[PDB]
Amino acid sequence: TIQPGTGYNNGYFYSYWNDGHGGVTYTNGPGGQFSVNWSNSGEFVGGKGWQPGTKNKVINFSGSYNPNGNSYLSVYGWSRNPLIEYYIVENFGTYNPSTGATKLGEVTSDGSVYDIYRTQRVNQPSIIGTATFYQYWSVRRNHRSSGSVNTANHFNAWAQQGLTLGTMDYQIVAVQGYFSSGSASITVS
Numbered sequence: 001t002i003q004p005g006t007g008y009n010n011g012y013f014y015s016y017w018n019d020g021h022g023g024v025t026y027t028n029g030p031g032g033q034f035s036v037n038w039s040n041s042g043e044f045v046g047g048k049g050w051q052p053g054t055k056n057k058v059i060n061f062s063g064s065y066n067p068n069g070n071s072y073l074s075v076y077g078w079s080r081n082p083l084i085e086y087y088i089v090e091n092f093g094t095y096n097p098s099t100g101a102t103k104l105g106e107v108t109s110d111g112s113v114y115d116i117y118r119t120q121r122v123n124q125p126s127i128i129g130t131a132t133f134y135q136y137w138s139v140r141r142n143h144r145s146s147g148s149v150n151t152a153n154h155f156n157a158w159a160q161q162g163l164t165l166g167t168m169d170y171q172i173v174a175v176q177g178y179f180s181s182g183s184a185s186i187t188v189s
């Protein structure tokens with residue numbers, strides 16, 4: 001188990017963040033592996049990947065994802081200038097993050113159709129401090145906890161629809177939770 005923060009572990013960049021609430025354990029394992037076990041958590045996001053991401057990375061992931069409540073499993077990362085939090089959501093718990101959001105298209109990639117959305121966070125934490133910024137979403141219709149994500153297909157379709165990214169910051173497979181419980185064990189490559 002590690003403190004929230006960022007660094008490298010067995011060759012992979014990791015980011016682990018929470019809102020301080022308690023109830024989440026993040027573990028870096030061998031190779032590209034990480035595990036998250038949480039019980040009546042606050043908000044948190046943790047996973048392994050790269051710093052910086054690229055616009056055409058093929059990300060592979062495999063393992064087990066057992067949320068009990070509000071949680072996502074996503075390729076997750078940020079761009080700078082413009083500041084964007086983005087999500088290629090492969091699975092989730094009790095909440096589809098695109099509920100109520102404006103649908104801005106579809107993309108077919110890696111065995112499923114994804115629905116595309118933009119949302120906005122207002123004065124929320126970010127990689128550069130409290131800010132108001134857009135989120136880009138690709139929400140997979142066929143949920144899964146293993147597979148391959150051709151991020152180019154998503155970034156290109158986003159750009160097509162006017163969801164353009166700035167300079168890439170980190171890019172990970174992440175388990176996210178908001179006041180929920182669960183376990184996950186995920187291996188990235």
Ligand SMILES: O[C@@H]1[C@@H](O)[C@H](O[C@@H]2CO[C@@H](O[C@@H]3CO[C@@H](O)[C@H](O)[C@H]3O)[C@H](O)[C@H]2O)OC[C@H]1O
Nearest residue numbers: 015017043044045085121124125126127128129
């Ligand atoms: O030490 C600083 C960190 O705390 C900062 O980390 C980022 C803070 O925001 C994270 O994203 C938020 C929560 O879950 C998301 O879905 C919300 O919209 C986000 O508001 C991101 O995970 C962290 O990396 O990074 C900069 C540091 O100075």
